[PDB]
Amino acid sequence: PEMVRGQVFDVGPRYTNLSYIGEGAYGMVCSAYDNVNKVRVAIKKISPFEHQTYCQRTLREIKILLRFRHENIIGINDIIRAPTIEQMKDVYIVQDLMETDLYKLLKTQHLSNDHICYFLYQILRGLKYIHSANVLHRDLKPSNLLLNTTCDLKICDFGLARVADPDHDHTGFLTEYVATRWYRAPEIMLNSKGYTKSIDIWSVGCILAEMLSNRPIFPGKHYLDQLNHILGILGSPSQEDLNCIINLKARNYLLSLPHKNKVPWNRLFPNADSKALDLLDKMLTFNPHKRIEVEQALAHPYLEQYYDPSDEPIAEAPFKFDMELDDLPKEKLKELIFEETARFQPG
């Protein structure tokens, strides 16, 4: 078998001529030549089976991505693994190969207002589909936005996704949370489990702000610093918004802070299109109940050159997990991953 930077990559005979792309906690990613479709593809080698959290992420992504079909959402083309549960130590996920991601692009390139517009449109168009399936992505950030050489955009990494559950969103103050800090809505630190669609709108808001300046808008250095940064720009929440926070720890924390005025978007973003800043304000609303929804955001003046609801498709039906996954041992989750990848086996 081919080796890449001291790792077996058992993807043959279909996939050859591998090149390293990258690596992270998830595993390792290569490009490979696909000898059936005669195209280079992305292959990621995941080795999740010793970690319940890794098995959860692998299973959620696979189930979601094999169900969903949308231009602004990465597909799974193929999955390679051993013929038996006993012999299966790795899962290789084959996906369309993209040139870059928005994280890398923002560190190296100024985006024209027209690029910002088009990128935001594609993000919201993909998100409309995801929300229409009653799914929350829950980890939207530049590195989860893949781009090709013509700036077509695809959302990736559905391993933190969940079905929306607005009736069970309430929790206590500073309750611990997994998703990426600079893109976390204020309510996560105050009273929310991140089980409503407004969590994703907040993250998109953060992405938009970052496209305008090439710098994250709320770069908290650590957990409660994240809310400091948010309140530093939004200012003190209104009495009405504060009254929506019924938990006393969270309420009284907010009341203890000195009055801060709103920093106006046109001072933070002096070169930005005014319509972009109006949409930005609506996405970065403190109160998640008042926060714009994905379909309204698509209908916003800033996106008028692109808006076409007949060309912004929705999912055929809501997505459901057959069983609750968070209370399943890694051994059961491995069984479910085996089952879920069975359709790619010869036979």
Ligand X SMILES: COc1cc(F)cc([C@@H](CO)NC(=O)[C@@H](C)N2Cc3ccc(-c4nc(NC5CCOCC5)ncc4Cl)cc3C2=O)c1
Binding residues among 11-40 for ligand X as defined by CB under 6 A: 21-22, 24-26, 29
Told to check if 320 binds ligand X by CB under 6 A, we report no
Question: Is 146 among the residues that bind ligand X (CB under 6 A)?
Answer: yes
Ranges within 207-246 binding ligand X (CB under 6 A): none
**25 assigned ligand-binding residue:** yes
Q: Is 159 in the site for ligand X (CB under 6 A)?
A: yes
Q: How far is the CB of 318 from ligand X (least distance, A)?
A: 21
DSSP symbol at 92: E
Q: Is 167 among the residues known to form the active site?
A: no
Contacts 24+ apart (CB under 8 A), 235-242: 235/260, 235/261, 235/262, 235/263, 236/260, 237/286, 237/287, 238/286, 240/287, 241/286, 241/287, 241/290
Phi then psi for residue 204, to 5 deg, are -60, -45
* Residue 283 marked as a ligand binder: no
State how far the Cα of 104 lies from the Cα of 123, in Å rounded to an integer: 17
DSSP 111: P
Cα dihedral 86, 87, 89, 91 sign:
negative
**Among residue numbers 295 through 314, which ones bind ligand X (CB under 6 A)?**
none
**Of 34, 139, 157, 241, which one is the catalytic site residue?**
139
List 69, 104, 260, 290, residue binding ligand X (CB under 6 A): 104
Amino acid at 247: N
Q: Which residues of 64-89 are buried (b: 16+ CB within 10 A; e: fewer)?
A: bbeebebebbbbbbbbbbeeeeeeee
Asked if residue 44 belongs to a known ligand binding site, the reply is yes
Length of the chain equals 347
21 labelled as ligand-binding? yes
Q: Which of residues 58-77 bind ligand X (CB under 6 A)?
A: 58, 61, 74
């530093």: which residue's tokens? 232
Q: Which of 99, 104, 151, 150 is nearest to 123 (CA)?
A: 151
How many residues touch ligand X under the rule CB under 6 A: the total is: 25
Any known ligand binding at 27?
yes
Q: Where are the alpha helices (DSSP H) in the chain?
A: 52-67, 102-108, 113-132, 186-190, 198-213, 223-234, 239-243, 248-256, 265-268, 274-283, 294-298, 330-341
Q: Which is nearer to ligand X, 73 or 227 (CB)?
A: 73
26 is in an annotated binding site: yes
Q: Which is nearer to ligand X, 138 or 184 (CB)?
A: 138
Which one of 11, 97, 106, 208 is in contact with ligand X (CB under 6 A)?
Answer: 97
Q: Should residue 161 be labelled a site residue for ligand X when binding is judged by CB under 6 A?
A: no
Stretch that binds ligand X, among 46-54, 115-123, 247-255, 296-304 (CB under 6 A): 46-54
54 binds ligand X (CB under 6 A): yes
Catalytic residues: 139
Binding region for ligand X (CB under 6 A): 21-22, 24-26, 29, 42, 44, 46, 48, 54, 57-58, 61, 74, 95, 97-98, 100-101, 104, 146, 156-157, 159
Residue ranges for the binding site for ATP? Answer: 21-29, 44
